Amino acid sequence: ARGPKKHLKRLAAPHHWMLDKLSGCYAPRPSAGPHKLRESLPLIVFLRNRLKYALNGREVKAILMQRHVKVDGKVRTDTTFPAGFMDVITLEATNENFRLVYDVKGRFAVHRITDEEASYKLAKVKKVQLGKKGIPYVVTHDGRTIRYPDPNIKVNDTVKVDLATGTITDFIKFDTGKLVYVTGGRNLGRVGTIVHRERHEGGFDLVHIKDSLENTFVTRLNNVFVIGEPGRPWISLPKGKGIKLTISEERDRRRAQHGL
Amino acid sequence: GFPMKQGVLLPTRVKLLLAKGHSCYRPRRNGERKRKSVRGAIVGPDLAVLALIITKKGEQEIEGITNDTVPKRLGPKRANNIRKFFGLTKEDDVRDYVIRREVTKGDKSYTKAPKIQRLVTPQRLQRKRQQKSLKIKNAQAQREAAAEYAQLLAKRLSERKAEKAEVRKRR
Amino acid sequence: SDAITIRTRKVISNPLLARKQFVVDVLHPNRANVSKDELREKLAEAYKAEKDAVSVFGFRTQYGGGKSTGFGLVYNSVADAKKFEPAYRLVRYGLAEKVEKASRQQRKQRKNRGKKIFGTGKSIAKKAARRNAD
Amino acid sequence: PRAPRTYSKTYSTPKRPYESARLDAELKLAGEYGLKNKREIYRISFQLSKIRRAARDLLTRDEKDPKRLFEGNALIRRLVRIGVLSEDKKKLDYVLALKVEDFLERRLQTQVYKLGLAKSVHHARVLISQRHIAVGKQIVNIPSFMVRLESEKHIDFARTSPFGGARPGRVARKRAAAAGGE
RNA sequence: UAUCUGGUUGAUCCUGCCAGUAGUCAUAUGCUUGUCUCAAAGAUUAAGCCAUGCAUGUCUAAGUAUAAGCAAUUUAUACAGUGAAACUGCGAAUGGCUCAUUAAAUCAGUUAUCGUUUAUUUGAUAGUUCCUUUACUACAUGGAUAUCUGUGGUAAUUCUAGAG
RNA sequence: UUCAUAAUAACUUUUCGAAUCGCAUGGCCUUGUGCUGGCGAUGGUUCAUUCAAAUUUCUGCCCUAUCAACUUUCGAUGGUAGGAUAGUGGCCUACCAUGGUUUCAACGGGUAACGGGGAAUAAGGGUUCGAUUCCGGAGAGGGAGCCUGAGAAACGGCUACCA
Ligand SMILES: [Mg+2]
Ligand SMILES: [Mg+2]
Ligand SMILES: [Mg+2]
Ligand SMILES: [Mg+2]
Ligand SMILES: [Mg+2]
Ligand SMILES: [Mg+2]
Ligand SMILES: [Mg+2]
Ligand SMILES: [Mg+2]
Ligand SMILES: [Mg+2]
Ligand SMILES: [Mg+2]
Ligand SMILES: [Mg+2]
Ligand SMILES: [Mg+2]
Ligand SMILES: [Mg+2]
Ligand SMILES: [Mg+2]
Ligand SMILES: [Mg+2]
Ligand SMILES: [Mg+2]
Ligand SMILES: [Mg+2]
Ligand SMILES: [Mg+2]
Ligand SMILES: [Mg+2]
Ligand SMILES: [Mg+2]
Ligand SMILES: [Mg+2]
Ligand SMILES: [Mg+2]
């Protein structure tokens, strides 16, 4: 295509979007934003589909235009704004806040966060670079170019963003023995207790990660996101804690917790 | 009916490529060149209409050009332009010297006057002050941040020196 | 024994639209489908709201009568309905008239005709009058 | 440009077109079950072939393998819920021997008759097409309906239509109108 | 959904095909034709030709207003309401159609860009424009040009010549 | 890494660093129209981020040997330097060298061949099809040329030839 592409066809949208392959030909393409359109989640899908707050795209545009949704403390009135991973969505109507965390199966499940800890945010550092005039800046997955960080912060780390001003609050250093959260591929949405970091120097560092129930799995570095030290997750996990129970236990707990 | 173009220096009609800036053509789409036919500049017999500007007044009055006068259509709009048009003593509050058009719809007499651009409102000064104050505030904030960062690195460097001294003395 | 039995399910109060949304199930023995406006009245008196500030649609009855399903909303005020509901349902409920529109091909042809001319039509009237005259 | 709505085929025509014994057997099952077209038997044999293929695929692997366990238990649960195979042969291997008659047993007209209401199962078929029978307050004009065991207790007539206490309907009513009038 | 049957000979076994058989999101065609749900559809020969109609235009409280447009009643001395036209900016490079060219070409899986451009979107970011700061508009620098008003040209075209 | 960044020296037919709009119009009283302050909208340098765009490694394409040598005077393979590119690159130019591929099928010819995700078919192994609902690529009669624009060699955009 001679230039950028603007239309996204309904089949091409990622499966985790949970879209209906029926009842429409197209899919809402996320605009340019802080996240990859393969990974993000447009507000249209979040509201019309996940929360069932509005039937039709038009009144979703209406909700957006009245400046009620608040992403990271900002209005973000775009109807297809790509509010990506573990951003915060505030609605002063109902006064309720959510945090976008993948569930155990992988998709963007709704997480009801209370107000006071909805203030801040957690970010994975993607680069640390000395900017112009010798000013060091750190950039995260959100693209939030934070200026003047603590000099001993490095790549692959997690930093606590205020989201009131845009400054660092605290940070956790990446190493072994640390509660981590997985954000890509087969182990999407899992929560782990990293046991090993393994190099293969020159490309695609891997990590061996242990769950809460001693089930180890190995995954690439770029899909890894630290969440706290062992035992105290800095952010409330979604229900299920991403332990990744196998299918037989899904049916066994559905039968055990049976009531209709 | 083919229009003639200035600067052709020819008594004949010629095909020519034209674009914006030139006459004899208007670009519908942005920046599109069109090859169109235009009449040359030398005047012969083959010209149907001559658009002649009369330069100097003549002895014989012509009925419908000179004795009458078409009213000047639209007054100056920019404030400096109005002052220049009226010669208005720059600090003379040109606001009230605009040429009003009182319009009569037939029964109600209403007012209609041009909005003056470039006019020095208190609002413009408000904007200027806003910009200047914000710029200075931001620059000062950045200087403060740089100062704090320098202090932090001095502290950490001292800590690391103390550690290396402890190790050197220990061994 | 008519006894139109209206019941609501899966309702949530959404103040974002200033609304309460729900799915309507209606039990009507020995009777056909149940005339939306009647449902508007019954729901409005049910939630102590005006017959205007309610909007219900999507009534599909199950195969064999008895029960039917639709989808309904109750707005906080009538102005909420005026400002938050697509106008076609306003015409259905009669609050707003059906805006007149010439057939779409008429509009498209007129738009092409407008694109044909550069500027306003005042400049071409007298000029064409003179051209046909002379 | 529109997403494809998938579809499928739901029967399998036999390889041999005119062998006798098979013809007699099909016509038999048609007789005691009142089947309309031979394609019926072909359909049920199609599901049965699907089940045997799945069962063979699962029996291939060792017992207690994860997929074997999960898939087999889900299949036999579906089978007992639909009520074809007994509750005593929950073994994933007895589901090799189905003998297509068994699936036909759970057919709606068949279960109607085996509950009564029918008097020549054929009548039941007609009744099904005459909207007189409901599965627990829900009529079904579908002769097969593949009635499942749990709801079998509630196959009865409808509140609407005759045989279920409603308006007589369109023939006795007009006869009564003609008798009253003349 | 691991299957075969008829034909060489007077007869028998074989190699062998031919024929029979069953599908086909493979079409064509014939004969028929009641209902529900769903739905392919000028690809094969012609990436052959096309009349006609439509298929990309867009303005918010917030870029430009004296439409000699409406509004003019209750907000109205610089205008302020609404809102043609036109200027400005943005998109028109997406979508849709087709499969002619193409045989390590396209493409698929997997890499790299420490080798590059990237409007937009989102984060950040700029004191110095002084140039000898004791003669400079910063309480705001200049001129145009559309729309429009008017005289027109061609047989006709989204043709536009001149003046204000 | 000659990377980021910094610093010194100079250079520039000196790029940018807000002469722009809406709402609200608070506080100080230096009581003047005086000094000042908000929520916004647009622009605006650089670097990030995103949407991409290009090129790119390896491996994988049907039939044909009644196609076995093919490519280099006109670029074929490599070197140096330059030009041109947004940038590597014979991409192109000048001067050199004689190399490059091939019976592990190159080169050539055919394809009623767009490639692929797939469809039909079914003990297992396979055979055939894939114009087309998704992904890429190519084209807008055929070829070439180009302005605008971040993005086109655009075609419901132009220029020229041919039909
Ligand atoms: Mg396209
Ligand atoms: Mg013989
Ligand atoms: Mg014989
Ligand atoms: Mg044959
Ligand atoms: Mg009917
Ligand atoms: Mg064709
Ligand atoms: Mg207005
Ligand atoms: Mg424009
Ligand atoms: Mg073809
Ligand atoms: Mg072809
Ligand atoms: Mg070839
Ligand atoms: Mg450098
Ligand atoms: Mg070089
Ligand atoms: Mg092919
Ligand atoms: Mg194909
Ligand atoms: Mg395509
Ligand atoms: Mg093209
Ligand atoms: Mg054609
Ligand atoms: Mg643009
Ligand atoms: Mg072209
Ligand atoms: Mg096009
Ligand atoms: Mg054009």
UniProtKB/Swiss-Prot annotation, chain B:
Alphabetically ordered keywords of this record: Phosphoprotein, Ribonucleoprotein, Ribosomal protein
GO molecular function: structural constituent of ribosome
Any one cellular-component term (Gene Ontology): ribonucleoprotein complex
Keyword Ribosomal protein listed: yes
Coiled-coil regions listed in the entry: none
Record-level GO BP terms: translation
The keyword Phosphoprotein is assigned to this record: yes
Family in the record: Belongs to the eukaryotic ribosomal protein eS6 family.
Protein name: Small ribosomal subunit protein eS6
Taxonomic lineage: Eukaryota, Fungi, Dikarya, Ascomycota, Saccharomycotina
Gene name in the database record: RPS6
